[model samples]
Target chain A: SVPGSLVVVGGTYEPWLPVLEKVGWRCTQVADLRKPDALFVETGPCIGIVDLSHDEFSLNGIANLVSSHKQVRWLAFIREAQLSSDTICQFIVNFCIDFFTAPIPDAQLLSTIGHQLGMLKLEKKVWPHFGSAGNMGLIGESMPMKRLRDQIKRIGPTDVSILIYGESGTGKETVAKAIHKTSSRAQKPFISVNCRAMSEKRLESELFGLGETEEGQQPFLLQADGGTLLLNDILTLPKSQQLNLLRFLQEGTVETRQGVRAVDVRILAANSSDIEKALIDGDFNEELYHYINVLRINVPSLKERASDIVLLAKHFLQEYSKEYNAQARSFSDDAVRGLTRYHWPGNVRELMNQIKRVVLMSDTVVLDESQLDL
Target chain B: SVPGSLVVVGGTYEPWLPVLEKVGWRCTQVADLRKPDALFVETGPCIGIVDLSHDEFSLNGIANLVSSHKQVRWLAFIREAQLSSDTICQFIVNFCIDFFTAPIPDAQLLSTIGHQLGMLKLEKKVWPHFGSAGNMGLIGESMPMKRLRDQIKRIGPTDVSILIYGESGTGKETVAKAIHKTSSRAQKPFISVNCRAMSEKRLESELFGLGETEEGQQPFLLQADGGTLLLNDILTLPKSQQLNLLRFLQEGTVETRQGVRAVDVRILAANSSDIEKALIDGDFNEELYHYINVLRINVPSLKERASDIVLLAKHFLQEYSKEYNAQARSFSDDAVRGLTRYHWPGNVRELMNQIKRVVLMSDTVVLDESQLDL
Candidate 1:
């Protein structure tokens, strides 16, 4: 979460940087950012702006190349050619924080740089608080939840395929993303594949990805390279694709219509149902299961962490209230009792859903037992 | 809030007072009860147990007669004939705290009497605290509600009619009963007539007892004599009944098929909507209104007593949650905020409705904003 600086691959990328105008600094090569004091001493900045003012390059390659450094924010020196291509502009907005155009003022660059650095300090100060307890988007203080985070800590950096177990709505995807964010793969794309979604044929084509790819086409498996692939309900993956996945796991390269290709990517699989039963009934392949089983985690149910029930409930409520533009601040005593009393059959997902609906519909700022209805 | 005893009419009313048995004392007649320390003196024994061994009186008349002493708790002398009549038995269960069966062993009689006396002492000790605050079911400790109770306290001793003003659901009947309960007239009956209910012709018949009355029939005015009459939504009374009611106020007797019968019944009318607007619209009868308007009371809406909103909201929530067998205890902080935040457009009535639904419909212990659709 660091603010980054740009490098001029061609002419001085921006029209201005009056502070450095007299220095005659000509950056003609793409490289790592340097510091004010010395070369590559402090690794603070997370961006590298490439100046393509005079030269032209394929927007696709740029988008791909820039996105690979997902941790690094990228800025572009805009030109008429790049403006004509909507693809590259969108890529810049998605991957970059801000942009600079040639024929710029020196003062504007220094000011913007100073401003971005100030934000970096602020985010640095705020990140830890926003990090640990909620860094994974997981909020809980219960002993069980604390222990669960310990498990994530020990296993997150391990270079192996991981599997997560939890009831539906217990936030398996959240845990998967948390691991990706905390691991060596943090800088890479964390692609979540909803295995249960979409048409059967489409998923089949997607899972296999044997179709010959165009030069610019991004296949699912290839996109996950050097990153993490989150497979939702992996046990439900078709048997035919299981073999393909197993083969990919066994060998570094995948056999495609183009040729055998090698790509490095970690796997994070999630199942919200009975894994043993799935394996027993042959709904899941033992080979693939054993491979991913090296790393497994069970997300605690809401009941299992009673102390966190109120915490998470409020968290959901506060979030949804803000999302829905509601003024509701909390629950009444009786309503709080109702929330803890009901056996949450749907877990956190249902909790989120209920909070969403309540925030959207309630006329009061604080809900009571009458509103809880449990 | 008084302790009373019974005097069996017909036979020895079954069993025995049996202290009458061991001794030569004979309670051979229909009469009042004697006290523990001495023969009948300070008349407040909540219940009266009478001997009705061979009783020949109809239970129907006895049940009605005995119940008029609503201020009194009437227990019956256990008997076979009493069981022969289901109505009086039900009246016993409904009205009595405990019954004394005689021809009992000497020690049991003393124990029963001792037990009954002990309860009397306990009730006597706690009644003042329980009685004043809860006597009318108007529960609240907020300043406005306290002042409202004070209004009842001050105006209660008088014999004048009262017209209570409030929005819908402000517990008009509850306050009316509170006034009557605190008044010198409390020992008498308090009858409530929903003015907007039933057919107009029937209301007129009941209000004036004009159509006719059988020997067995108890007319509304007659039933309320020497007590209080609460007219709900009093402004909506029919055009024809207004003159009849005005005549009753002026003449001290109501015209009926039987004749103009004089009765002493205190009137307590309630209306949530605008009293002046109804009067201005001629929807209300000026003459009748003036008669009952001498002593006016305004039961504030839930919002007018904003300080009491959360208290009352919690009150209703706990009540409905308990009523619906929900496990809810109270509102969450946000829910409390919501309860107070809502304007309570329908006043306490609408508030009660929202809580009722929320408690009945929710699956959680704490009601969030979702439950308060208002």
Candidate 2:
């Protein structure tokens, strides 16, 4: 018996045979399942390769074979012709450890197989470190995201006050943080104040901090004098407060509610609602909107950039998995499909929340649609 | 005749009828060519829709018909099942202006048609700047490029040295320039010294800066003080010079060949050759390699990221068109396929050169495979 041998079942053994040989792996060709019981019982091969050339086996057979032989690793090779067969692809996704579509490159096939073998080896050696989550920063691969990052880099150094616009939960605050982090004022304090969280009077007082002489008062602008002041949900600020912001934008100075002293500070504001709509609704002053909208950044919605869905989901999974002290869990193929297909009306925040819940509730190592709640 | 009408062909009208009606476009159904005369005669509709459900007309016939008619723009509605048919897709690419896969979103369909109409209107009004090749930068939609740009941004502020590794002509120099442009040192001078282009003695003097007494004077390090020194092909630096560079890396200053003065300059090195092989061959000093390899970034080869081939080719076409003052030319489906399949041994630079030559040489408005040597 060859050590770490892989068994490939199906297809004309023409393309993948050479790929396996190049990767230093001995492959046993099994074109049919005539002696299925003998192959599974006596073969003792650690890796099983399923060639999805034909939709011969039923879904039950696939599921049973995969679930029953949990110890054996499985990889599936699929062709473009076979991809149209929904049942076969679905079955492979449900049962296989990984898959590659044909006209598969030799390097990709070798690397994938090597990676699977490495994982199997590592599975025995390394104990699970399940308590820590991965980073929660923006994860995306869309053209718009790339452009946005480039723009952020360009604008980060300049002292220009920036205004960010996006739908609610689109990570406007995160963008603000990223800008601050990349700027020269990174060592200085980065103060965040959500306009919607406070009343108009209190918000104004909080923004333009009271003088030291006043009780329970410290000049807010002075606190972030040399740094960035992130004003989130700016459209939610009252019309009167918007006027105060406009004054600050023009003069580069903020007048405190309790004191006559004006403090110099750089302002960065983010709003979920359209500033134009807010102006028309009389919720925002038109002059104020124009004043702060000097450098505008429009963040795309989640639905518009569907490419980031899986990346964000994986990011949140690593995040909440550590928070809940759960084992590192990944979404099943069905769950990933569900997440990708479902419209994220609530955007990133909703995704974050759902992933958090899944991490806390999921009993198995893999996450499924049961925890997603449709 | 409806003013904003959309004509449907090929597939059964059942799937697209409701979608067209919902979009408020008057629909005219035309089953695949029962007669040859039907090809030339316009449906008198604003836009013509071809549904590739049940193939009646040959792909070439459909393409010929669509290409012949200038009055009506073609849009294809392809089923997911038919995505495997390269001939069908190729025909669509050559003849159709836009396409939507079946199980199409109603909103997307409506908006796509609206956008297409707007483009067509603009096309008629203004011979819009079609192709001007000057815009070729690091154009990509892949995850690696995005992450690399993000990483560059994060590290841009810090004065740490960077090292980029990739195959020859893989846009390492472009990325280095981008980093310098995005960093705080943008105002400062950016000097690129190609180690492979000069002798070891000249390379050393050029890097560390010669004294006023030297004939070929002014070393790059002294000239680039407080700026960035982009050392291209660092692996090609002679072993003796590598030791000197290693000493400089350790001390954060370099001693000039003529003078005792130490220059303060940040290093950004790029290499195309395999450093490990150089070390094994005793050509590269191990200490120096370790010192400069602190922040290594590997650029993906063009073959590995095939998705970017068409986009990059188009970019180069636009770039060369402007330089040559040629008419706007677009790539034919066959040309695109040829580009995607060709192994770009010299990477982006080779592709750019080939594309530039093709753009200048091609007489027709549409680029064909004959223009490229492949």
Candidate 3:
């Protein structure tokens, strides 16, 4: 444990300095209460020892000293006669932690100082808000969130294709990004494309490149070289494209008119529905699914981490307030009840929308249930 | 949860606005990336939804937009052909969380939004520095410290004389203070006096009044009227003064020369040693001891709370560094080991001096065992 700083006020420093230094205390003697600039530098946990053994003392100066250094715990040593002075009596009471009369025991003082430091540390650590949130911007201490974060940490460093399954609003893509952000390929590109967005010809050319003649046109696979590529709605791929994609997945390169180009890219496939179901329905090729499904991740839905609703609600409210410069700060009891009790068909996205609407339109600091129209 | 703010870039807002609003999202249409003052007010978690379906779009403007609003989690909608454009592919890869292809599912987008919010919350709450301190500046989580605080809270509201027992330097007075500071008389005066500070005649006169003759001489008891009076080293009171104090404790007033004056003062007596032994030795008056011992509080020694050693050491170092403008910031492994291993004879006070010595003399950021010399 570290030693505490002591500002020894009044009395010659000789008597206390040696005793204190032996115990590792760095004692600074304050001569003039009015100009103890020496006390200004030291700020952490400190003890101010005032010697009121003398009859003549500056009470106002001492008061000013104690008032300014409110952080310093105080102790006092005084002659029995000093108690006769009301001002001195009040000073000890108002500022000092404890006072010792003549024949003060060195051991006793040491013990008190130890305890004072303990008390300070105790107060600093005992706040209720200490352990409320999770890591990786994942909120909620719910089991699923914790498990999800743990899984991310475990798999983030390894280079492997992953098939991510999660309901809409379940954040499969975010999970993929978190993995990429934490992985060895963090500095490289992270490309994501919705597989269903283009025709077979368009997607084929877009993914593999037209040819050497296209010049500026870069294939998505090559663009994501030495990085990650998230194929959103992977099951929506045309069978022809799936076969083409499978060839690249197998060789880790694409055959272009220019030549066969190699790219080291980790593929992350995501779908709101299971690829197994799509494969079973004869909509997705089993061989193509197997290539991307080497590692699997299931992003939990917002309803799965229901305990985080209130936290997410308030967090969204805070964000919207800043974004829109609105004032709605908190929810009324009924509003909170409505939030927690809702089925949340849209999951977290729906919650964000609800909170955002109230923030943008309401001027009140607290939003009630009626305003939410739940 | 509040709806998220969305910067809809490129695509006309007409198609997505109504769908997004139904979920409570506040969508802002950004026509130009060169000037986005509308996006400036938003500093919270947000989403930027870019439509890459168009072949013609401002890549530079979108890049500027996304870079400036780094807090916005981005999503994209693009045709497969867009992947052929290196700039578009890089933009999507570098900035967007995920991209959706054509035939976009509304449920899927909403679900994606929900999961994004959850991820944001997880990252925000995962900080380890969350819960380390205590309330009312009383620190440490050792059983004794917790019990001490519980005791303070329980007895603080009631009116009773409390006899605080602890070893030397164990902060018996601080316990008294925690009580007084939390008590009903918190706004009233809190006076503490060292009983051994004065002789019998001086102590008696100081505790009560001298007489009506001294107009400005307010007695310690009267000065602490309506508040609390902590008598440190109560065992050191002279036999004659003890008897007089007993009379005041019994009647709640001292018989002055003019007459008896009543004062509503709560007395807290503290002793470093066992007053029971004083009673056994016939050195202390039994009645006087009983009067102040209505409620006894035993403050645990610093050695009793050895678990808080590192916390105190660090807390003290932080304080002293600020105080003396020292650079020493932390303890080395051996220093920490030594700190926790040592007996702490002076308890926290000894620990404090040791750390203070290193902080004052050493200019290093990490203090070692040799520096502390524990």
Candidate 4:
């Protein structure tokens, strides 16, 4: 009828066709809701006028059409009497961008259509993109996180020993895994060895190799041969354990019962905080620190990359909801705000635990901040 | 009954005193709960054993004593039958670290006392510090925030134009105020002018003085003479407006009917993002950009300082509660976690708005994450 495209989806468009034509609306009368797609394609990007006043209108079919064609800026014409039906009211609320009562003036109807046409044009200009994935699945798009991923990409291919520094719970191992995955030895094993909470004797045997003994076990260092071995809490190792690692790093060999065996292991070390002062104070073996500190990567804390909190929160919500078979679909706006405002001391690990508890305990589909109860 | 300091506030200590003495326990028996402080001083840092079996005991007075002497590790002796009284159960839960049924064995009692003594010693070793205040009341203790304050202190004394850069809602003006207050011009006025939302014609008149006329108003730049003028959203100004500001910065002069007038004002310009690209693309006037970009300060986003979330949350909770006459005292642990974990895109201003809403709407003393709904 006019220059701008419009899809009239219910009843006949004959009564208003002349008025719409005068206003420059290029109108298409869609017969069946099921076949609305072809009509929309013919009309290009268009505004949809849904006349729900007709008794033959299939609510489910109309809903499906609306859901499927989200690009359509939909307006509805409902009988003033139909507003009494909660179902009709809900349908309008859920699907229509704007709804009007039927038996409206021609001029009013044309004006409304003109307004929606302008709105559609404006909406066309508003567009977007977010999120970065596939760097070992590290979740975040903040500058610090993007920089961290870039650092991993640059350093991952190298064979030099790397030292990662960050606060506790900052996901140092996640970075190590990302580095390993990006390296040429990705197909090989990526072994993580925690350097704390083990006896000196056990640590020595685990690091080097057990004697040709009863059961035939391999040392942690030997097991990670030709791949990356991440030593967590590296500075927590005692002086004797540090000396043992220093010798291994200096010679590129682990002492076995048979002989000193050469192991092609790329060492990745992590500390909860800076090791410089410890080295200067003689608390840590300076030689071991130097060996591991050939390259450095500082993993940003959750606090440092705050923009990722809600993204990760929603991610965990989806994950735990599936894991626990919970009803929660998403967070309320307030809950999202609450989640974003929190200063996560424990970082991502803490966020996961909280979300897990919320999914297991909460009963609602739209989870609120009370469920998180930070 | 142990070889440690113990204050017994009960009906009688005669039965246990001999056993306590035999074990080298230095015991003090105080009959009046209200007067226990004097006895506690004599016993020094000691554990308190309260016998709540008798109906004659003044529960209110006993609660006061327990609340007042928080340093005292308290254990309660209650009749097992009296557990049915919810009041008695609640008192034990509220005031006692540990509680036991009366007619308890002497050996069992001694063991409990010994354990508590060790726990008290361990607790003493676990002490702490947090929060930085009084930098113009900019609330945060995270490293970035502390460093920002340090930068303010360093640059405040000098009279140079500062280009402040940060994401929107990051409180650029707060840094401006901190600088103004720290500067030699502390007692003078601090004026802020938003460079957005106004027409080009209106902006020129506002930035420079209106010629002598009815009711005579001073220009924004002249108003801040001998003080600081913060140009918020500085790059949003049109080319003509930028040129006008540029001329003022270059010659330190303003035009009025009185003739060319000079004003000694400190210029502080802030932008939501970097203006270098804008300058390079010729969108922003290059001369104006260089004029204001003499010295630079970067205000950290709320996401960049996540550790301050809970501290600021509690702080705002207190502030708004007092202002709105609300009941909320503090956030629950989950709510604190929720607050801390949230990725606040809106920064401090957003936090203030959400906190204000919570205080006005919440119905409880201990506000939980459900209330936050984030």
Candidate 5:
């Protein structure tokens, strides 16, 4: 059975009751803000409509209520004039799934509820199959990306060691690719090794190739002789491996168990986690971090540039459409507004997967709110 | 009547004659490349069929003949086995309008010729408007763009003068906007001054803000207080005004000659032309260049990253459709191939205009070579 829920905190409910019933919601009215916590805990409603038109309840109280009830998607009703206020705008942007301005059209209100419900259903279906490290590209037109590209071009031409610092899913590997592609060694091999993905023993063998038990063996560094080597998540490398990497950086040579050989290779290291904090914590080698930090490029988070949501959404839509052979479809204006308002903590990778899922699963030509997971 | 011309350079004309007639082209058979240089130039053929299946003529001779002839769109026929050679591929990429690998079907040959004729007619109508840079947006998902966004973020916070260097039409303005939007003064105005578009006196008047003797005096730097002042082609600012601009960068205050007041502002400058060369030629002041060069960002040329051509082309298609209120159209596989292979000398802005024109003008749902001005 479809659960009908009504949440009114210190405001009039007379106009909203009939609108809920027309939309097939089984309305359970809770009038007092004090009793709302009890009602939410007891009833476990699927939807909670908060009335923000009252002066009695603080905005924090409403935020607390929404945050507490994770099961129920929160909707809000505010005065039409309040829609233009920054406070109310920030409230809707941060907390609510949807909102309606006073003298709200019945049709728009009903559709918003229906769309929210549909989105909840779709989210359940698509969440399990979402790709790990989903958002790979940089999303925003923020200043960081511009500076990073500039530094990359400058550092790329020279054979300088570069250290890229950013949070996870901030496109560290992508920056490394750009540097290698633009450099004088562009035509040469661009080998990337994830320090965290491998065990220490295997990583050592991988970086400085495994030696034969009986005799001498050529190291992997020999293979990357005249090319660029991208070491990803370098902070995750064990201290022993860090020492070995530092030797290679300092001497331009790798000492395998078999023999030591000079190599003409440029090192580009990336750490999504904070290397400085890790160094202070003794998780990473300070000497190694500084050795490769000859040129540092820091990548900003997607949340920092919300203006890029629509652009990134459209980009991922086209990207996955070709990959999945789905027909090209555009996001509805409402969906774009929702995307922009929502904070993307997971950055570009998360947005890519969300849009890819929508492109693959959406039946309609226009992407509605239901087609995406917030 | 449509002039259907053919250039048969040292090739047996027997095979092409039937294909030309099948496509309704009047064959003007040239036994050798030299015959048509002086006399046969008046044919004004809309289609030029080059039967290279038998000829061993020099590429220069072929290119010269094609260039000497006006209104003749050249299409070449090469043996299927020879199509894999680098020589033929290079020629196809450089000189020919289109090429067919033989044992070509008679019907396909005729259809291709007919299509080329249609494209030629379209090209005549489209070429004049091909080079305009009017769109305002950062467009691309390639690794280069990812690096570009990363660079922008780092340079965004400081009030240091910025120097943006890129080939014309690479959307330097878009990069400037990214910096401004991410800065502390995002709410203030972002004024763009085109350095090359005005004379030195006019440029100074615009940059320093002109004074109206009758009304009131207005300073240009005043408008950019707590905001960004974008100077498009900063290298073009005359040498005489360099010291004044340099002082502003050093002191963060622009003192106007007129009583417009000394103003505090942040300056971001872009030059499509080479700044180093401008300084060398005395067109740009070396000291001023150093002041702005404190933070330098280089926007990558489109040709340097051909992989982004199709991605950018589709982006522009969607963008212009919304701008012009047109139905969504997809580029044909052949058209996309042409775009990817063609040298986009004018960069993103040129590509945007071409795609915009195609989206607005083409009546079909799939953009063909005709619509793409190929």
Candidate 6:
């Protein structure tokens, strides 16, 4: 709905959307089109409907954005009298797919935009191939993958703690990332943790959350303030440390070595085991189990879905092949054959590593089982 | 990402998305408040963070959306001095969760959004149950349904003719509607036509399109002039009628029996057959084939996506159950099993027909297969 999406620059074009929505273009305006590059990054790369009446700074700013992302299509709405202005024509002709005369004929404008959207799809220019995989890379198009995508999509809009379940190689971290990328929290930082160390003295100090100290520096949780904290194997937390987390989940306040104070951070927890069983076994506090389990998503392991193995293998090969400038263009039938047959104990992480190694080291144009060494 | 999704209702208050994107809370802005219902329909049932200093019309408009979709969480951005205005306080008390002082602090705003979104999830208040079936009926939750939804989303933006394909009963008419609902042409009319039965002479006469009649009555095509023309059973059109349609598609002009003239209207074609093959077989025109086929989407059949059957079934049952005030509030396990087991030779239409009958006739609170008469 790019027409629903528009950047009306230069004027206090705030009231333009409701009127235009009636005529059929439901536009969302940009604050300024003066910084064309920033505006392009923000408002456009879809159909950039630019209102070009602006000061010199904005015009050149637009000029820069247009010159850079030519793949973008643009439309300019101008005053009929302003049609004769040279500045109007320059940006109009240089960047716009079409121009509309002022005292805009509402009906004609609607028809024109509909035609443009048809052309946009014809152009096959996809805007925002969105979703980020944080530290762990994730890819595939199997049913489980779709389910994971759907879950992340639903979870993305909400701000709550998520308990992700999968083996180490099942992309539990990537789950957090995909969730983070699309969530309302996408703009914030992504801090991943590994709760593997035995030092609670050290763990308590750091996991204890940042607090006032001799150095006056905050702890780990404090560092993740206002962002998402990807909790690693919480199964490794000492009993004392686990209680601290239990309290944090319950009260929204964490007790650091300093003292318990309120801190706000979206928590994303991961584990390779029956996490809730820990509470029953007395390793994890029972209260924290019920709290975190409120939004639990189990990531299906690679072995669970037969179809995704080859898809993931080929996908990683293509990306890393380009990344490392390797001759391995794709996975040969044998490579694909080997991948789907193997019982992938390491899951996606293992497949990613295998592909990464092959793409970087192999010189074969099409990767085969020999290169894959499966 | 509701937090990141904000409509800064006033000012040159644009360019906030990128800054918010950097600080966190990636957002989009709405240009106006007039037709607040349409604005809310398009942007949200989600969080609407409204900026309050607006002309009189917009303030009332904002109040309307807030009041109607009271479940929609709103945050107001306003000057403390402006709060003294009784009008400002009215919307604030009625709708907004909280109000912020002007000279807005960016960091604080981001934290507030993160907090709000987190609460949104924890609170689990999913907003914006958007995109009605409108005039055409459609429903589903399968991946194909998502693809269809995503296609409509992409199509809603541009100004181009679209060619939608599917077998009869696949809810193909919904394609035009799905596109129209979110499109630049949303406010316009949808006029589906039959190229069948009419003679090329009569068709050409009207296809000759609207002109000055003695009474100044516009022709059917001109009556449909500013709206989208949904082509029905294009396979039934004669070679001559095809050419007239072709000319319209090719140059956005047609030699109505009256004269050659430019008429603006979006084209959405439908079929119960393979239209591309019709063109190749010479039953359909070649030039027009390429023109309308520019943006093509095929609606997958009911049998093709079994997963959506139950979803669509319940959806229809609920709507019409409410419509007729029938005692049949839900389908029993047997009814569900019966649906999945059927071949559904008639696709969505048959399912819709069956559900419509049940919602109107069935008396039980939970509908069983006997009531469905599978």
- Per-residue lDDT of candidate 3, residues B1-374 (tens digit): 33244433444544545777686655655544333423532222334455555533333234434433232222222233323433224443231434544445656555445554443333223221122243624645665565456455544554556678876656676677777875657889987777657776667666563543365466777778888888888788777777777777645675455555777777788887534335533456765665555455657664346667767776877788999888777778877667666665566667767777777678678775464554
- Show where candidate 3 strays beyond 4 Å: A1-137, A211-216, A255-259, A371-374, B1-374
TM-score (second chain) of model 2: 0.58
DockQ of each: 0.00, 0.01, 0.01, 0.01, 0.01, 0.03
* C-alpha TM-scores of all predictions: 0.32, 0.32, 0.32, 0.35, 0.37, 0.36
Q: For residues B306-340, could you state the per-residue lDDT of candidate 4 as single tens digits?
A: 66776778778777888788888877777766776
Residue A88 local lDDT, model 4: 46
Against the true structure, whose DockQ is highest? 6
lDDT of 4 by residue, A79-181 (tens): 3334532334434212233455555565756544443453344333321111244533466777667656656765565555778767677788887887777
TM-score of chain B taken alone, every candidate: 0.60, 0.58, 0.59, 0.61, 0.58, 0.58
Residue B147 lDDT (model 5): 49
In angstroms, the error of model 1 at B163 is 82
Query: What residue runs in model 6 are displaced by over 4 Å at the alpha carbon?
Result: A1-374, B1-138, B194-202, B209-217, B251-261, B358-366, B371-374
lDDT of 2: 0.56
lDDT by residue (A82-192, candidate 5, tens digit) is 344432233432223334456756665555555445433332232222211213323444434443443444345445566787667667787777767655566887778
**Better model by TM-score: candidate 2 vs candidate 4:** 4
Best by lDDT: 4
Error of 5 at A221 (Å): 11
Q: lDDT for each of the candidates?
A: 0.56, 0.56, 0.57, 0.60, 0.56, 0.56
